[PDB]
Design a protein around this ligand. Structure first.
Ligand SMILES: O=c1cc(-c2ccc(O)cc2)oc2cc(O)cc(O)c12
Ligand SMILES: O=c1cc(-c2ccc(O)cc2)oc2cc(O)cc(O)c12
Ligand SMILES: [Cl-]
Ligand SMILES: [Cl-]
Ligand SMILES: [Cl-]
Ligand SMILES: [Cl-]
Ligand SMILES: [Cl-]
Ligand SMILES: [Cl-]
Lengths: 150, 151, 152, 147, 152, 149
């Protein structure tokens, strides 16, 4: 059900400054994940994107959505297993149908909504939205391959 | 006004990265009250050190963000919303008292600052209040700050 | 309007700064048609601290971002030429991304070359598509639409 | 003296939140004298403040707390890196802090803490931060060592 | 012993890490004789924030450092080959630097290539000299004496 | 005696490449004593080295160069922020560098440079880096002062 930052750190190999999921609030094996990242001015990205106009990069929304899809794929296959997590990679192959509707700024709670669209063998296809305060700010479709870490 | 966004905070507070610790102001009554917040996320540089494998937003930075909330209240109460006057101001801590930390603050928390003015005279502002996550009190603090022209 | 632009020229046109300016040099530029630019990939980038420990891989989403910034440089110089005065009144906004493929991973020591062509443009709305290349091999592909908006 | 390498074996804090450089005096259950060098080459000065570098008062207090923590760790268990690696430090209270003089790059920030009261993992310390023999800050604080 | 080494191999031999690992790839290596390596220069390096604002110049002393790290890689591997287990126990300290000359500024977009050659070696003591080059032009030259020391 | 705020007005260097914190002594055309405080709370120590913080020797030499540049500039033009923005101190050569003692967090890294010779805009300086009386490094440096492009 609920996974906190300690739990996310044991499953995802991502680390600062590229770990872009703070908490998982809903997880349904093989179906869907609801997760989020808090947006704050005290992030390094905002030094350059943009000076005097802080806007969370669209591509990092898509990345945070990828990280949520990967956590869902992994936990669907093995559950919360830190030991197996160390031996796996989720390689993202394609990104499709992404639209940005509302900018994301410091003070926003950026909620990733992702569902499994297609799972066939090692290939996972996941899609959904990013939301701030019940409003769709971004949508994206993503495809990933599960493999062994080397 | 009563709601201020990061663009407005940037125009009033002299603090910048990595020491600007208020993201949004939800309410303020001039000379009286401020409610504001900072989002807590793993994607902050402090967490590299505090602590490895166990991210805990430092208590001293909760106090700092509370102080910055008081200083936004202080400036706008003195001169209103005036970025041109603001640009040459700084803020100094004078005192800190009666602080208690109750609950650890972690990534994914929305850290809400509630400050009330206890006493103010000219540039010297004494504020007290709480920091809250999900309606619970995580920290209490009393502090005195001075607004000063940069020289 | 010249065809080669260096970092000091890019600074004057793009509003992006560290750690989000991901184009180092422009090597080729045809107004309203095409741009070739590149970013040098080095271990000495903060991003590699997290992506990943002991295994530095330049993030795919940042390759796309680099392609966008290349497109936004093309878009702006096409409409205003090299004009830093007017460049300061603008910001680039991502509208859509589609058809992105990640074929080969990008690592420290790579010269990440961005090849973009204008697919459609009207006013501030620019639609570009192309590839990211390392040593003449297609490392990634993407199409994106952007808008140059008044900074307000 | 305990040097940075020894401090790293006892305190769990790391960059950019390790704010003690060297321990010059240690007396078990009594006092500690330690310092941190202040240099322009620290990331905090980018924001505090632009064009006027002033070491944050709250980080003076943090440094004092970390000094207190080192005194707490060692009075409890001595110099034992193995036990230390299990623990972290939690701030419980801060009280009676007064800042008198701004701390700036080029300053040697000296921490003087004595123990006021202690019980189990709970340590109450108080004292001053000093630059060149002058008191720049006073503080009292209570900390807890936790698994 | 190979002649080509990538970032995974450099990380296993050198103890340097961010922001002080200043070699990205080794293109040529001859034991006890020479190394050719490079570092990519990108705007996306923190060093450029302060050297200098609006005028990114790669610090000359960091060109020297990258040359030294290349030399230390050559030194270690000349003696033990590619031995990560032993590298973890050794550290190369530079004792002297001489005849440093800076000829051309190094900027974002540049491929900073280190050409080091062994002038003298007895045991743990190594004297190296050479150049940093960009586009086959010499941007810096230096001589250095290093020491293979214990890490503990 | 110059403080960081004075230093910031003369040197174009900013974070993380301004490596002088205070000027304690300055004789025009003659010498400078200056220092940089060394602390664990510096970004360089993340990689130089993990579990063993050692201030890079090339950065010691950089701090010496910055001190030597400050000496040359103020010798000619004094404390002049306006003229400073129109001038560049460009280092051409470095020679006779020796590293004797490692510099660590907690050290006050003191730079002692004298003018060896000068002719026009070409200035040669040299001296030591010292920690608590001991010589930790020596170096000679030649700089050219030029107009900001
Ligand atoms: O997005 C991910 C990327 C990777 C990854 C790790 C190493 C690579 O060389 C390439 C990709 O591993 C993962 C492992 C996971 O369990 C989950 C992920 O989302 C990822
Ligand atoms: O420090 C500087 C050094 C150089 C430089 C100039 C000539 C060289 O052979 C090597 C380096 O150019 C510069 C140009 C500037 O506009 C500013 C500088 O500080 C520098
Ligand atoms: Cl964007
Ligand atoms: Cl704390
Ligand atoms: Cl990726
Ligand atoms: Cl303060
Ligand atoms: Cl330089
Ligand atoms: Cl060194």
């Amino acid at each position: 059900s609920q996974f906190f930052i300690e739990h996310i750190l044991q499953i995802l190999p991502h680390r600062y400054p590229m770990l872009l999921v703070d908490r998982i609030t809903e997880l349904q094996a093989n179906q869907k994940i609801v997760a989020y990242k808090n947006i704050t001015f005290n992030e390094d990205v905002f030094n350059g994107h943009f000076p005097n106009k802080p806007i969370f990069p669209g591509v990092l929304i898509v990345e945070g959505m990828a990280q949520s899809g990967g956590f869902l794929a992994f936990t669907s296959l093995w559950g919360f297993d830190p030991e197996i997590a160390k031996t796996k990679i989720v390689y993202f192959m394609t990104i499709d149908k992404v639209k940005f509707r509302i900018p994301v700024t410091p003070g926003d709670r950026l909620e990733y909504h992702l569902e499994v669209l297609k799972h066939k063998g090692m290939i996972w296809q996941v899609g959904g939205t990013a939301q701030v305060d019940g409003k769709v700010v971004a949508e994206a479709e993503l495809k990933a391959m599960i493999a062994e870490r080397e």
